[PDB]
Structure formats: C-alpha cells, structure tokens
C-alpha cells in the first residue's frame, strides 16, 4: 500500500505518497468561521472553513490557526484538517495506506501521545511512525553529519548531527519564529501610520513580507543606505487597489533573527544558537560541524540569510575553521521530502507502530520506539 | 635678597607638631645654598633644620621682640601666619588685650569672663577722637561708624562674624549700647531703653542651651537704629529672621529648649500658673528630653522676673504676657497627650486625659472634635471629602507640626509687637545697622538647619571676600593706579553647589514635589549629579545616607534624614480649623492672617537671605571678625591650633596684607578740586584739574609714600584724610581772620 | 521661578483641548478641539460671519454652522486647523507669547513619525518657541496617579491604548492601541437612538447626543441582569429636554452603548473588549513582574468616567487571572484631566529643564531631532 | 584588629568576621544589568545591580554570574561584588581588617594571582591568606582523616586526606555541579509543556530545584512508583499565581550526580570518583577513608543522598569494610566556618602573606607561601 507522509506545519500542511519527489497536497493550516449574521436561509452555508475556502473569504470569516509554539491548539480543528487531506484532497482512506507524522524535538509527551491516540482510533490507521522534522531535512540534504537550523512559521530548532547520532544535550529550541516576524512587520508600518487589526489584513502583511523581506549582510549600511539614497523604497498594491510604500521594514523584519532584542526577547541570535551548540559538541567533530551547516524551513528562505550566516559564524569560530552554509533551493520543501525517503527504505518498514501494537502496548508505546 | 637677613642669632618659625610654630634662633648664618640651617629653639636645644631641596626655601622670620604686642599687625616688619598668631597668642595670654585691628578688621577674642573695664569716662575717652588716636575697642568702631554719618550722611553698618562661643553677641549688644548712651542727651531717653529692653525678650524666645554655648541665639536679627540730622536716634526697626522648630520639640541629652519654657516652670508657684495647672519639667516631652532643667550659675525665677519688667518697660501689658503665658502652657499640656494605637494605620486617645483635659480647656475648644481630627484625617481631594483613620506615629507628628505652628504664630507676634512699640518718625536722616546671626555649627549629626545656618555664614564671608579683596583690586586695575594682586579664598563655589540649576536646595524641592521622592532617592540623586564632578562634595566610605561638604572653616557631614520633611514644613488643617475656633480670644488672631509659586523653607529662606544681603551692602560696612579660645570654656586659655584656624577661615593674614598695602581712601580729581578749594593758590590752579590736585597735594604732603593717582581719582592712605580736613577747616578760619 | 518665566502645558485633546501653566494645579484653559465654517446663507446686510470660529464661539451656533474635528483617531486631520487652535490657546484663553516660553505637547503611542516631526517644524517655525517636548499621554497620566508601577489603560474620545509599567521602566512588546473610542460610542449611541425612533442626521445634533451620552449612560456589572431589568421593570426608562424643549425617552441605551467596550462585535469590530487586551498585555509582561500590575490596574481619560466600570472591570480581570492574585482597580476623579496634570508636574522639574529640544537643536539638527530625543 | 573570612561561592558569597558561629552577610553573587528601555523620568536607577537588589528587578534586568566552573568571568563584576561586601554590607574599610579568601584545587594560577593582585592594590588589604575550600569544611568537621566530597553551585570537588596530610595524587575534580543540575531540570519540565527561557525563570526553577527535588535510594523503584501511584506528584505555584505540576522530574534531576550521561557527559558518578580516589590512596588509610566519608557544598543538601551514598559505595568497597557517610547540619556554610576557625588560630597569624611580601617579593608569593 502507498505509505502516507504528512508534515504537520504550523501556517502550511504538506501531505503525499512516499516515493514522490513533491508532496500532492499543499494548503494552509488555518481554518475559518463566519461572522456578522445568516445571509439567507439555508444558501448552502457553512459553520467552519478549510485552507483556501477560508482564504477566500478573509474578513467574512475569523481565522484559526490549529498550531501555535509548534504544539496543537485544539485537537477537532486538527482532526478536521488530517480529514481534510484524507477524504476531501487525497481522496483516500487512512484505514489503507500506513501514515508517517513528523514534530519539532522537545515537543511534550502528551501532544505526541494525543496525536497517536486519535489517528489510531478515530482514522483507525493500520501503521503509524512519529519523526523528528529535522533530521528529515538533513536526510534530504543527504549527508550523515551536519548541523541543521530548521525555522518555520510557529517553531525554530537547532540540531548538531554527527554520523547520524544527533546530541540531546547540545540540540536546541527557539521561541522566534515566521509568526513573530509578521506581528513584528504589522508594527513597524504602524510606525508609517499603516495600522493593521484584522487576520484578514495578517495574511496580506504576511504576503507583503514573503514578497519583500530581506536578510542585511551589514545592518548599519543597508539602514545608512535607506537614509541617503532612498533606492530601497518600493511600493505594493492591496486589494483594495490602493499603493502603499516599505523600504526601511525590508531589512528591520528579518534582522531580529540575529537581533531579538527588536521584540524584547533575552535570548540569543540564531547565529549564536548553532555556534553555541557547536561548542556544547566534543572538540573533535566541531570542524565538520562546521563545514555542514544545513538552513532548513520556510523562514530561512530569505535573500542574504546565508552570507550574513557565514559571515557571523566566521567573526565567533577560529580563523582557520573553514565555514560553509548549505542553503537548499526549497528549505521549506525538505522535512516532507525526508519523510517520502524514510517511508520508501524496505528496512525502516519494522519501524511503524501497528494498530494492534498500540492498542495492546498502550499509548507510551510511541516514545518507546522512537527512543 | 631677604638671604641676607638670616645672619647669625636671626630668630625665626620653625612649624611645630603641637605648638603650630615654633621660634628658633640662627645659630650660624644661612650661605646661599645652605640647604642645612643650625639653629636654637627655645626649649634650649640645638637642630640642624633642612630647606626643601627643589627650592631652598627658608623659614618665616620673627619679627624684633619691639614690634611685638602692637595695636594693628600692619605695624609688623614680617607680615605671615606665625607672627599674627603669635601677637593674638601673647597679647590675650599676658596683656589681656581681647581686641586688635586688622586694618578695616576689629578682632574680637573672647575672655570667658566680665573684664568691667567699660564706663561713662571710656565714652568721654572715645568722645571728641580719630581713629588710631586711642586703642583698638568696639566703642571705637561705634564712634569711627557715628563719625562717618555724621560727616557725610551715609548709611552705616556693622557685621559680626564668629565661631558659636566667640563673644559675638555680647559684643553686638555693647556696640548697640554705646549709641543708645550716647544719643542719651536726649529728653526720649524711654525709646532708647526700650531698644535695650527688647533684647532679654527675643533671648528668651530664640536662644537655649548647646553643647557650644549655653545661651546660644537660634534665629538671626538685623536692627536698623534710625537717626535724625542732629545725629539723635529716632527708634530702630528690628527685622527677625529663620528661627529653629525642632528646638521646641526635640532636646538634646546635653542641651535645653528655649529658656521661656524653663522660666515658666518656675513660675508655675504663683496662682496666676497654678491657674494653668502647669507642671515640672519632667511631666513633659518638650522640657524633659534636656536632662537638667536647671543650668549652673543661673535661676530661671530670676530671669522669669527680668522678662516680665522687660515687658513693662516695652508697655507690654500684664494681661498680654499673661496671653502668652496661657499658650506657652497649652504647648507644654499639649506634648504629652497620650496616644493609643489600633489596628496599625489607626490611633485612639484617652476621653480623661488630664493634660489633654486642661489644654482643650485653656483653649476653650471641643474635646470629642479635637480627639476625632486627632485619630482621623481629611482626604486632599476637592470633590469628595471621605475621612482616613492615621497611625500612632501620624498622630504624634500631628501634635509636634501643631506645636511647631503655634510657637511660629507666638514668635510672629511678639516681634510684630516690640517693633509697634518701638515707634520712629516717618523719615530719619540716617541710620546705622548692627547685625547679629548664629555662628558656623557642627554636631556629630548635622541636619537641614546647620546646612542653613552654614550657608548663611558662607554668604557673610562671601561679601567680605569681594568688598575687601575681589572688587578693591578692580578698582585699582579700572583706575589704572600701579598695584600688586591680592590672594585670597573664593567661597562663591561652595555657593553655587547650592544656588545653581543643579544644586542641592533645587534637588531637594523636585524631591518635595514628586510624591515617590523619598530619603535614599535624594540622597541618591546628589551621588548621581555631583561625585562624578565636583571639588567641594564627596561621599564618606562606610555610611551610605550621609554627604560632605568642604565651607570656608572646614568640612561638615550632613545626615541626608531629615531633610525633606522640614523643607515641606506642612501642618494638618484638621488640627489648625479648632484653634481658629478657639473660645479663647488670643488664638484665633494669630490663626487669622493670576498665577502663583508654592514655596518650601529651602526656597522661602534663601529669598530672605538675598534680601538681607543686598541692604547691608547699601551701607558702608564695618567688620569684626570673633575668635573663641578654648572648647574647655576655660577663662583666659588660648589654643593655637584653636586660633589658627579660625583665623584662616576670616582670611585674617591676607587683609593684613591689603591693608598694610594700603591707599584705602579715594576723592575724583574734580571732587578734591572742590572740596580743598581753599588749599589751592590762585597762581596755581589750571584749566587742567587733574594737574591742579597734583600740584598742591605735591606741596601739602611731602611724603610720597603715603598718595597715590589713578585715571580720574587719587589715592590715600589711612589718616591722610582727616590731615586733609584739618588743613581745610585751620585755612578757612585762617582766611576768615585775613579779611575779616 | 523668581528669575525664570513659566512653561507652557498643553494636552493635544482629540474633542477637547486643554491648556495652562507648568504648576498649576488645573488647566487655565478647556475648550472643545471643535472648527466650524458658517453652512448657513446670506441672511445680514452687514455679515460679519466670521470664516471660522473656535470652540465655545462654534458651539453658540450649532445649526449655523458644521462642525469639524482637527483630531481623528489620534492624529491630525487638517494642520491648518490645527495652528488655528494653538493661536486660540496662547493668543486668546492664556493670551501669551509662545516665542517667550517652553511649550510640552502630548500625542498617544504608535503615532506616525511624520504626525510628529509636523507638529515640532509647526510649533519652532510659526510660534518661534524656545524650546519644546513631545511626551507620551499614558507616562503622564502614571506621573498623576502618583506610583512607578501600573497598567495604564487610556481611553480618549478618538484613541484607546494601554501601556503596562513596571519600575522606571517600559515594555515595547505590551503596548497594545486600540481602535475604538468615545467617538464611536457616540455614533452607537445615536444608531440605538434611530432604533427606538430618534433619527439623528448632523454635527450639530451629535453634540447633543455626546452630552446624552456623558450625562445618562453607564457601565453595566452584568449586561444580561440590566437587559432582564429593563425589559421587566422599566425603572431604567427615564426622559431628557431637547433644546427645542420637547422631551424624549432614553432606557436601554444606557447599558447598551458603553458595552461595547467590553463587546465591540456591536460595532462590527473583531478587535478583543478593553478588559481583555489588558489581561493579554499582562501576560506579554514578565511573570516576576505580573503580580504588581495585578494590583495596579490604572483608568485614565474621559471615557472612562462611566458608572460601574471599575466595579466591571475588576470582575472580569478576576474571571481571567489566577484567582490568588489581588486584583486592584485605581480610578481617580477627572481621570479625563490627568495627563495634562502629569504634564505640569513634569515640567515643573529642574533637571528636567534641559530635557526639552530647543529652538538651536532643531535649526541645527533638523526634525528627526525629536525621534532622537523624545524617542 | 579582628580579621575577615570571605568564600568566594560561584552562586552564592558569603563573608565575615573571625570567630563568629555563621556569617554575617550570605548574598547571591549574581550582577544584574538593566536590559529594558525606562519611561519614568526622575527615578534613582544605576548601570549595575547586585544580589537581592538584582533579584528584586528580575525579568527587567539580565542576570551575570561572575564565577563559572570555579573561575572568575569578570574582574570587574568580582570587584564590585567585594566592594558592596566590604562598604555596603560590612562597612568596615579592608585597609585594617586582614582578608582570608577560598577557592577550588586545581584552579589555574592566574586565577590566584589577579584575585590577590585586586585585594592587594584595589583593597589595599594589610595581610592575605588563600585556603582551598575542601580542608576547611573538613576543619569544621572536626576530624584529621578523611574523603571529603565538595559539590557546590559552579564546581564539585573530591580530596582524601590523612592525619591532615592530602594525596595530591588522587584528588578530583568534577565538572558537573548544581548549574547543570537546574538546566537539566528545565530541559526536563519542558517535557511536561513548561518551557523557560530568561534568567528570570532560571532562578525560579532553582528555587523548585531546593524546595522539591530529592535523591533516590532506588532509581528504578521511583520511575515505578510515579507511573503506578502517582503519589510523588506534587504542586507549585508561580510569581503570577498560576499552578503547575512536577513529580518524575523530582528524583531524576538529582539522580544526574550518580548518572552524568543524563544529559550526555561522559564521567562517571560522584560515588564512583569518591571510590577511585580511595583506590588511588595506600591500602593502609583506605579503612580509615570508607568511615570517614564526608558530604560538604551546597549540591549535597538533597533529601536521600547519605544512604544512597552509603548504599553505592558499599556496593563497590569490600564487604569487611565499614562504610560511613557523615553529613552535617549547614552543609554548605562548613567551608566559611572552617576559614574562621583557621584565622582565629594564634599559629596561622604568620602565615598571612602580607602586602609588603606581595610588593617586595611579587604576585607568585601567594603560591610560595601557600604552597
Ligand atoms: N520566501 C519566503 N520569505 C519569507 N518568509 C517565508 C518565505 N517562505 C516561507 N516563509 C515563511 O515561512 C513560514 C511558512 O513556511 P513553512 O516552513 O512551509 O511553514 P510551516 O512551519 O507551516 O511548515 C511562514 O512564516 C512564512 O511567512
Ligand atoms: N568684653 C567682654 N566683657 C564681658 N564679657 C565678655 C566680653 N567678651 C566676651 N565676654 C563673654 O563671652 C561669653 C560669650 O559671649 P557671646 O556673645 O555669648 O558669644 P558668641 O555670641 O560668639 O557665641 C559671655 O559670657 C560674655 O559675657
Ligand atoms: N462623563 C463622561 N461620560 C461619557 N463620556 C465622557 C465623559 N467625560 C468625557 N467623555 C468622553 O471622553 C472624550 C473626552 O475626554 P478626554 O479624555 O478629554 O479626551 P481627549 O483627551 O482625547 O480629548 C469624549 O469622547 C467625551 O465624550
Ligand atoms: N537545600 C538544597 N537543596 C537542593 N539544592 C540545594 C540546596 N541548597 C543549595 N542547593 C544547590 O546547590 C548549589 C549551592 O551550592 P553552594 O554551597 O551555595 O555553592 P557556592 O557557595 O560555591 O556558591 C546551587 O546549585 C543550589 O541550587
Ligand atoms: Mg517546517
Ligand atoms: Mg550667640
Ligand atoms: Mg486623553
Ligand atoms: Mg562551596
């Protein structure tokens, strides 16, 4: 049977076959529910929405993302989104085909345990296998020692791998993620007067900082820039059909990556994180850490984010550590990908939690086969 | 060339540890680049003294055993700190000789005792002189000051400026009395006796015990004796200024409260207190902290008895002392109310409180009101007066802000009273003013009121400095006149750390105003504004809510607690609403009186200060500076550690050194060619007036030492003037025989 | 001082301006921010119907003519209007020079930089002010309420926002604008109005319904209660005198119109009601710090000055929060006039005298000096 | 004059006179610095913080340790630390009070020389002494033989000693100390859903460390009763009032001292060094060793680790060999003690190196004399 591989993303579900080089489904995570009053009777509405027929009807509807901090939210409306792929997109039964999940590491006991429970049961799925985003992508990335930063919309994490032994005591996790960066984004053009209120108008600003967004290679000269030439400056259309103009939040959003102190955060610059975890590493595998470091996620696609990466990584290490960024063309496309990989190894396939197992063994069974 | 005086057998001063200085006769003749000097000192031992060797600079040199004891320190060879020492030290110690000039400076010693030299044939002996024609004595001050209004209408003042136990004010009160007996030609002898008679009064009000001086004055008070063309007094207007709060409730183990208190007690024998119920000095707070209620040498009966024909002689009358007396009761009653706590932020007091029983009584008001206002509280808020209940400590601050109020509204009076008394004509010709203030303090803990009192004397030596050295040495310079630059201390820095945009009393008022401003945050505040910069402030290690500051005589550390709450000075309205509903006539008198400033102590004294200052400085100004000799109060003892210091802080030395410069008196060109018209011979006076005055003062004094020019005035020196005046009035008559 | 002339105050009201001295204890000078142009028609021989009129002068001639706001939400609409008022304030109520003396002005938080950089370039160019200061409206209305530490929520006729305060410092990342304000309530109000018959169409009639407003609405402690109430009692129901002298009946738009405060799906708002955005700006705050905003919860501005809403607002904060924690709601009266009394106790400090942008700085440096200064 | 004893703790410092039962002052070490922008004008606030002045500011300002791993961070913070000590805590000048410091062995020299440097100048202290802080908490314990183990904050330490007289030889070192212990346990509550990231929360998860954790006499025996009984599981509420739970989390954390590959170190167990070092000394004190155990620092202060200790060491030792664990009343606060003992002996007075030694002689004095 064609084993099912799904990555749960935090804004952006990705689901398809193993085998395939690309996922077949692709759609938000956030879901939809109406408002104002009952237009007509009957009129075939709807009490909720999915994905793109909830996007179509920004401003009508409220949205609702099912994950937030890479950790479910409310477990129906992540239950409506598995059904969704299922029956509605790839239009075929869980009940059939083996399905693979994927989470961020250090993610609660709980949430994994709860996520197994229902997919068992309520799609009575007859295999299962729970794994870690980030060693997927660094499957992609084909090689079996590298230090993989993964950033998506709700999460960030970063994983020192060496000869495929990951390090549990030098792995980390990041609060900042692409959400914090829109809400960022939303404030600094209030500081031009565009004030924004609505999740009608998020998703646009989320568009606008996908479109234009970019990472400095030197902060003080692209602001110095800004200032004297101007030539930074563009302008966007809304749906509305009116102009807005965004020059100077082009490099101020993506920068708190490496400056979190922008939204008041302590912690540290992604850049100090994957250097800090490499000195937590043993001395000796450190220089091939270092010439193995993997961007992975739909936040590192940013322009510049790899030279800035190197050029920051090259001013903390030693002069004569040779620093490379493995930046992938699709970063955000990479942890599905892996998990097709994965699924399609005729050795892995003892690897899959069956139903009669879980329901026998119990739900901790999960953590006792992953680890 | 001075190398050539320090021959064999030259006595000089060599510093000692314990004696300051110490006399040393050459026992060899300094060579040039004798590095090593043998001499003799006068314990009767031999030294081989040593110069300092990046200089061979060598020892101050004693002046001949001739010049020793003289009247004024510019009559010295040698002009240096080790001989005007040594001349106050021999002169107080043997002579006892209390006063010598400094040129414009009397100095002023205290003896410690009565020297009753003073008498009716010392005022014929002072009468009908000049200045220098008999010795150094306030009398002389007084009549060189008379002299000077009567000669050519100017105003006058005279400035005390001493330790606390230095004379000052008994010197002060013997000056005031030599004008008073010598306008007492006069029929209204009666407003001259009242002039002395106020005084007894305001001592009894304003001075208490100190661990420095028993008698010590806590206010200051300018007195302005008006006179009219015949050069009589017409009256004086007495102007009273700051006088201390926490007097009249806190008293030190070792000190007392105003002595008005004391006398009080023992009045309290007569029916007239017995009326009052008053009690012992133990039953209550504000006499009883002192420890002795009775001081050596003294009886507060005798002194009840002297305030009281004090009064008489004023036209006080027996029913307004008795006024007073009543108040002064009601203060003493109310300082032991007894207070209650309940809850934490609530306080009850007793319905059968006795003291409280006789002081609502007294003041004829409601005793369940006052207890209410006692134990609750009004909220600031205009729209809505809810009541708050207060804590045991609110209430016992209530009592004291009362008292303290009341006391105020007291002293007010009485002054306003004794200046009614003291009635003048609506203009005098011209007036002379003597001034009295408290002196530089220093305790073991020092508060706002000694960083007043010090920066009111810091302003005292601030004019001083300028009047003597800093504008006298423009005048020369402006005129053009040949002249060498003086030395001497500026104080105005130790100033502007309290007047500026910056400074202390400013910072102290934006700490008053914010309502979070608290005792570490200002404190704080002037560490975070002053220690990074400053010369004259500094932080001490150990102690964290102190501060010091470097003033003219020496550095005082202020205790940064207690300072925002006697700058704020409030008083709780809920308290003065029922003694302005007092059924005792006196209390409601004294609680009855686009844009606006609120004014703190800090702001509302310092105004008064500028004021005062400025009219003194209208005058022409005299000044004695006060020497006290020994802390141990002991008669006739002169400490020179003591001694010198107190004369580096006048700058004693260097007005010697102005004055033994000379040339102090100055007329225009055109103002001498009128005056000594008379002088000039008509073949010798020339368009040109400048050469006129010239020529004839070229014949008139020989010695060219004595006259100087400037650009438009000349130049003499002391004396020369009355030479001058003696010539004019012996030529006129002259003149007046030849044609007659 | 006594060497040293005053400083001006002046609070930058969206309906109400207020102006006076740096340490009074009130503004000398309260005025509606109110423009009106005559809408009228030739009607005297010798017309001396002013091109404008400002405030009290607009207000004696509602119907004559239209009323136009200088302010909406919270940043200027018309500059002309704008200079027009500040004229008024020093040249009319306070009668003074501005080119003798310091001027503070006040603006909500997330303001435009350019509604800021204007403001200064209008004050230093056509008042020739020596010097100046542009402070933020939630600090002063904190200097009034006399602590170092509380969630100031302030709420305006044509701005909301609230600011959570621990120690001297400020946290950017709680700062939360909001979109309603007083206005709108009016706007509600006269939609209810319409509801129950009252059909109101002009400025002129607005202003008669913002008064209805202030004088007869309050906040309910349980909205379903006061509907039952109305509905079963009719006690709420009460009349009001037009100015033509006929009466009207007004009831349940008492509760109904500040409610939506608390519930801003009246309007049509997904925006969260005033209680919640101060519990979410609480927990964007460091827990460590939580407990003290817990118990000094702060109302400020005119809108606030309705009864029962710090009854209401601490139930629902209690609701919300951990129920350990002592939930404290500060409301001092004039909430209204508080910021222009924390201007004037501001400016009435000496070390702060040299805080403000002068005349010199802003020829030098340009008007980005004051997002360097001030920000 | 009396003189000064000072334990220069890596969280906690601890200072006072000669001869007093306890110290006179206990601080934390820990300098805050402000992190957050100000909006009040006119409030008395400084560049830097200290101790309960620097906790009582928590989340506004970032936490500094000046000690890490037994060795100075910064100069300047360890300066302003003995300086508050000395004027705002003690208030009494070191011109005239002689000062006793204490450090860990095995510290590099450096580390000695510039602390002494700083006293001698800065402090301009009349005479120094530096003593290793394992021979004073075996002075307070009152014995000449014996194996004491030294867990503080920072550092852990392990030294037998006989007849007063040291084995060079065989002492240790370890890495691990109560820092990593407090890591583990956040890493470890993450895993429950509590999630920390600020200094702010790192001393309140300390503050659960001492308050509920506790050694197991059986590792197995405690994973058995929290899955079965769950009576293990207690309550904690926060800063906010907000509750949370813990239980599994109690006797794991402190099990990481028998058990570094918790996180991922490879050492071996406190036990195991206290063991090897008795192995190290000669068979003929190694008896008088096994019955002179003796627990010191802060880390030992755990409900349970004497019997475990005894339990473990017993397991390893000979049977014949009577093992046992002294483990006193102030555990942590021996070492201060024992300084206060040694400066108030008549016969140590000369061994104080006094600053014209320093002067004269140099900065490597220190070791001559001590050594
Ligand atoms: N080209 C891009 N530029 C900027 N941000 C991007 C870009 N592509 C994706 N992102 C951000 O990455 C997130 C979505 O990417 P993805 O990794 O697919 O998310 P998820 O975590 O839902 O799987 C969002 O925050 C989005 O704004
Ligand atoms: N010439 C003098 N004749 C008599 N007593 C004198 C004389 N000079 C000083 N004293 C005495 O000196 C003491 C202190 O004088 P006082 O004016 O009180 O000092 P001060 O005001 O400087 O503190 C008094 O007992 C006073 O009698
Ligand atoms: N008592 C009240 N009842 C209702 N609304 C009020 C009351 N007082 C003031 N307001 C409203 O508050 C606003 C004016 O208050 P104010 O704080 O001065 O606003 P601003 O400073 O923004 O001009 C207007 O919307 C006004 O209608
Ligand atoms: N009673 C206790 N229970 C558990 N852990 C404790 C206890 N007391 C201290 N600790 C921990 O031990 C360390 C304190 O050790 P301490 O002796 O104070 O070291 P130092 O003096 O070198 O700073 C910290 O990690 C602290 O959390
Ligand atoms: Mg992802
Ligand atoms: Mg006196
Ligand atoms: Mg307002
Ligand atoms: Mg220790």
């Not at chain 2, 005007?84 to 209390?98: A, E, G, M, Q």
């Not at chain 2, 205790?559 to 029922?578: A, H, M, P, S, Y």
Request: glycine share 6%; net charge neutral; proline share 4%.
């Amino acid at each position: 049977t064609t084993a099912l591989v799904c990555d749960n993303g935090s804004g952006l579900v990705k689901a398809g076959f193993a085998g395939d080089d690309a996922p077949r489904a692709v759609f938000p995570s956030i879901v939809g529910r109406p408002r104002h009053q009952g237009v007509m009777v009957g009129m075939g509405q709807k009490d909720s929405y999915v994905g793109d027929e909830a996007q179509s009807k920004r401003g009508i509807l409220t949205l609702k993302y099912p994950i937030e901090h890479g950790i479910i939210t409310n477990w129906d409306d992540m239950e409506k989104i598995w059904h969704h792929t299922f029956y509605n997109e790839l239009r075929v039964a869980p009940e059939e085909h083996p399905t693979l999940l994927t989470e961020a590491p250090l993610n609660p006991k709980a949430n994994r345990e709860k996520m197994t429970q229902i997919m068992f049961e309520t799609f009575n799925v007859p295999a299962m296998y729970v794994a870690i985003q980030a060693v997927l992508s660094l499957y992609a990335s084909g090689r079996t020692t590298g230090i993989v930063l993964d950033s998506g919309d709700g999460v960030t994490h970063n994983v020192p791998i060496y000869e495929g032994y990951a390090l549990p005591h030098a792995i980390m996790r990041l609060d900042l993620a692409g959400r914090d960066l829109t809400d960022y984004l939303m404030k600094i053009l209030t500081e031009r007067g565009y004030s924004f209120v609505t999740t009608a108008e998020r998703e646009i600003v989320r568009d606008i900082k996908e479109k234009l967004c970019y990472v400095a290679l030197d902060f003080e000269n692209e602001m110095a820039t800004a200032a004297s030439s101007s030539s930074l400056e563009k302008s966007y259309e809304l749906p509305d059909g009116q102009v807005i103009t965004i020059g100077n939040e082009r490099f101020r959003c993506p920068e708190t990556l490496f400056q979190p102190s922008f939204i008041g955060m302590e912690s540290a610059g992604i850049h100090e994180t994957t250097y800090n975890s490499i000195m937590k590493c043993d001395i000796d595998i450190r220089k091939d850490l270092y010439a193995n470091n993997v961007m992975s996620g739909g936040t590192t696609m940013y322009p510049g984010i790899a030279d800035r990466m190197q050029k920051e990584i090259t001013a903390l290490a030693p002069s004569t550590m040779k620093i490379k960024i493995i930046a992938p063309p699709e970063r955000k496309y990479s942890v599905w990908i892996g998990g097709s990989i994965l699924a399609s190894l005729s050795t892995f396939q003892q690897m899959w939690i069956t139903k009669q197992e879980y329901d026998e063994a119990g739900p901790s069974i999960v953590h006792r086969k992953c680890f | 060339a001075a190398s050539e005086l320090y021959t064999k057998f030259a006595r000089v001063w060599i510093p000692d540890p314990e004696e300051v200085w110490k006399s040393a006769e050459l026992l060899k003749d300094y060579k040039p680049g004798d590095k090593v000097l043998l001499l003799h000192l006068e314990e009767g031992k031999d030294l081989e003294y040593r110069l300092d060797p990046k200089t061979g600079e060598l020892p101050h040199l004693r002046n001949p055993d001739i010049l020793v004891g003289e009247n004024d320190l510019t009559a010295l060879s040698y002009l240096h700190e080790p001989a005007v020492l040594h001349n106050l030290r021999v002169r107080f110690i043997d002579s006892k000789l209390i006063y010598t000039y400094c040129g414009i400076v009397l100095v002023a010693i205290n003896p410690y005792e009565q020297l009753p030299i003073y008498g009716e044939d010392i005022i014929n002996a002072y009468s009908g002189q000049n200045m220098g024609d008999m010795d150094p004595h306030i009398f002389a001050v007084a009549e060189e000051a008379y002299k000077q209004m009567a000669r050519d209408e100017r105003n006058q003042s005279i400035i005390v400026s001493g330790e606390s136990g230095a004379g000052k004010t008994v010197s002060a009160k013997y000056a005031m009395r030599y004008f008073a007996t010598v306008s007492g030609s006069a029929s209204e002898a009666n407003v001259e006796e009242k002039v002395l008679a106020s005084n007894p009064i305001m001592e009894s009000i304003g001075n208490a015990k100190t661990t420095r001086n028993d008698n010590a004055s806590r206010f200051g008070k300018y007195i302005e004796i008006g006179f009219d063309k015949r050069y009589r007094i017409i009256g004086a207007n007495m102007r009273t200024y700051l006088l201390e709060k926490s007097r009249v409730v806190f008293q030190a183990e070792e000190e007392r409260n105003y002595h008005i208190f004391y006398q009080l007690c023992a009045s309290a024998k007569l029916p007239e207190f017995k009326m009052l119920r008053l009690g012992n000095a133990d039953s209550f707070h504000y006499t009883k902290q002192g420890g002795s209620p009775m001081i050596e040498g003294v009886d507060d009966a005798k002194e009840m008895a002297h305030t009281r024909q004090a009064c008489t002689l004023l036209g006080i009358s027996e029913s307004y002392q008795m006024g007073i007396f009543r108040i002064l009761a009601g203060i003493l009653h109310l300082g032991n109310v007894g207070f209650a706590s309940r809850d934490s932020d609530s306080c009850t007091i007793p319905p059968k409180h006795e003291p409280l029983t006789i002081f609502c009584d007294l003041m004829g008001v409601d005793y369940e009101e006052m207890c209410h206002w006692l134990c609750h509280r009004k909220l600031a808020t205009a729209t809505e007066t809810y009541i708050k209940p207060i804590s045991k400590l609110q209430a016992t601050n209530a009592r004291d802000a009362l008292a303290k109020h009341i006391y105020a509204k007291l002293f007010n009076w009485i002054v306003d009273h004794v200046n009614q008394a003291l009635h003048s004509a609506v203009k005098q010709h011209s007036f002379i003013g003597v001034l009295d203030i408290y002196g530089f303090e220093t305790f073991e803990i020092n508060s706002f009121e000694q960083f007043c009192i010090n920066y009111a004397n810091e302003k005292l030596q601030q004019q001083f400095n300028m009047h003597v050295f800093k504008l006298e040495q423009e005048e020369y310079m402006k005129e053009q006149i040949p002249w060498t630059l003086i030395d001497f201390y500026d104080n105005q820095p130790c100033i502007n750390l309290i007047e500026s945009k910056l400074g202390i009393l400013d910072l102290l008022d934006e700490e008053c105003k914010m309502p979070k401003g608290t005792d570490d945050t200002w404190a704080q505040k002037l560490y975070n504004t002053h220690l990074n910069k400053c010369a004259l402030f500094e932080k001490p290690r150990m102690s964290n809510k102190a501060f010091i500051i470097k003033h003219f005589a020496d550095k005082v550390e202020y205790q940064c607690e207690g300072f925002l709450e006697k700058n704020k000075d409030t008083v709780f309205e809920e308290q003065i609403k029922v003694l302005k509903s007092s059924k005792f006539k006196m209390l409601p008198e004294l609680f009855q009186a686009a844009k606006e400033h609120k004014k703190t102590v800090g702001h509302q004294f310092r105004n008064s200060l500028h004021l005062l200052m400025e009219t003194l400085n209208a005058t022409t100004p005299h000044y004695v500076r006060c020497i006290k000799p020994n802390d141990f109060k002991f008669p006739f003892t002169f400490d020179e550690k003591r001694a010198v210091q107190q004369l580096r802080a006048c700058g004693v030395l260097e007005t010697i050194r102005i004055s033994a410069a000379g040339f102090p008196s100055r007329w225009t060109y055109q103002e001498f060619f009128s005056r000594y018209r008379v002088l000039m011979k008509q073949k010798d006076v020339l368009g040109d007036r400048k050469q006129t005055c010239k020529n004839v003062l070229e014949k008139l004094i020989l010695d060219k030492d004595k006259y100087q020019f400037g650009k438009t005035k000349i130049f003499f020196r002391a004396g020369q003037v009355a030479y001058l005046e003696k010539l004019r009035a012996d030529k006129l008559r002259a003149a007046c025989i030849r044609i007659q």
